[PDB]
Amino acid sequence: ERLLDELTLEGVARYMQSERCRRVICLVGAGISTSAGIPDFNLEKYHLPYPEAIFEISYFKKHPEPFFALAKELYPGQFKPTICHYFMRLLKDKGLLLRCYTQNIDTLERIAGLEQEDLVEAHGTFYTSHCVSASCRHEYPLSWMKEKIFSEVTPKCEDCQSLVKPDIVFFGESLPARFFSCMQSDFLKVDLLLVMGTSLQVQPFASLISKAPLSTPRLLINKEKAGQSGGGMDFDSKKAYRDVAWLGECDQGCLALAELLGWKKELEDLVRREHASIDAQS
Amino acid sequence: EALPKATG
Ligand SMILES: *CCCn1cc(CCCCCCCCCCCC)nn1
Ligand SMILES: [Zn+2]
């Protein structure tokens, strides 16, 4: 029931290069976007009942304007995916990626080249928006929403003038149905979990680590150990057998893993070319 | 009842 030869990054690499590792699932959080300038959460200017209300569906339903104002204030001057995003892109290109489950709404996975079939955006995204009226549900792309946010015009539907909301899951909202559809099949077939940039404190996303088979190795690349209790993470006990913790910056851990897999030069060229191509079209 | 909700 032990598939790793040693509980290190090198053991994970050698396992990835073995016949048993055919399907890899990535579970990613805010830590994989911090080096891109996107915050891992002032707000006094918005006059909120409590600072967290800005992220809850109740307050957005009451007053949607503070969210759009804050979206403009935190709107990144550039959408540049990180080394971690392009490592997942390499996993996709080589046929090893089964799915990327993400907690982020910043669309950086799609900009890195991951497609809809590769992604489960568990908390939604800014990539698309919809008119809130159920008899309309008109869809708008990211450029439309960005132009509405920066002109400081509250986004209204061009067909029925109702409010248009980014396709994100506020706190208190139900997760999208694709989450629960994909999790049923994906976590019976998964051979490896790559948990990157999340401290596993948001539910039901965190519980995903207990859906994998008990023999499936799980590598945590995070600034802190997390997921320790239940099918929780066990990095340090005498009964540890499958969980590996690499503590540090996510970009650094992905660089080390890619080098151990022989992908250092390719990942370098990919990241540099894409960052330059984004700086050009900026 | 509804699908499980995002909770911190
Ligand atoms: C259970 C749900 C967990 N959850 C909710 C969210 C998003 C909450 C609102 C974020 C607002 C971001 C504003 C824009 C920032 C810049 C990017 C365009 N995440 N996780
Ligand atoms: Zn409409």
Author numbering:
A (entry chain A): 56 to 96, 106 to 293, 304 to 356
B (entry chain B): -4 to 0, 1A, 2 to 3
Please share text taken word for word from the publication where this structure appeared.
Sirtuins (SIRTs) are nicotinamide adenine dinucleotide (NAD+)‐dependent lysine deacylases linked to key physiological and disease processes. SIRTs catalyze lysine deacylation through a distinctive mechanism in which the amide oxygen of the acylated lysine transiently attacks the C1’ of the nicotinamide riboside residue from NAD+ (hereafter referred to as C1’ of NAD+ ribose), forming a covalent ADP‐ribosylated intermediate. Here, we report a new class of mechanism‐based 1,2,3‐triazole inhibitors that hijack SIRT catalysis by forming stalled triazolium– or triazole–ADP‐ribose (ADPR) adducts derived from the cofactor NAD+. These trapped adducts inhibit the enzyme without covalent protein modification, prompting us to term the compounds “Sirtuin Trapping Ligands” (SirTraps).
Compounds OTi‐1 (3, ornithine‐triazolyl inhibitor 1) and LTi‐1 (4, lysine‐triazolyl inhibitor 1) mimic acetylated lysine (Kac), whereas OTDi‐1 (5, ornithine‐triazolyl‐dodecyl inhibitor 1) and LTDi‐1 (6, lysine‐triazolyl‐dodecyl inhibitor 1) mimic Kmyr through their dodecyl extensions, engaging the full acyl‐lysine channel. To elucidate the molecular basis of this unexpected mode of inhibition, co‐crystallization experiments were performed with SIRT2 and compounds 5 and 6, both in the absence and presence of NAD⁺. In contrast, significant melting temperature shifts were observed for 5 and 6 at 10 µM, further enhanced by NAD+ addition (ΔT m: 5 = 9.9 ± 0.0 °C, 6 = 16.3 ± 0.1 °C), indicating strong SIRT2 stabilization. Without NAD+, rapid dissociation was observed (k off = 7.1 × 10−3 ± 1.4 × 10−4 s−1), consistent with a fast on/off mechanism. Preincubation with NAD+ markedly slowed dissociation (k off = 2.6 × 10−4 ± 8.5 × 10−6 s−1), accounting for the high potency of compound 6.
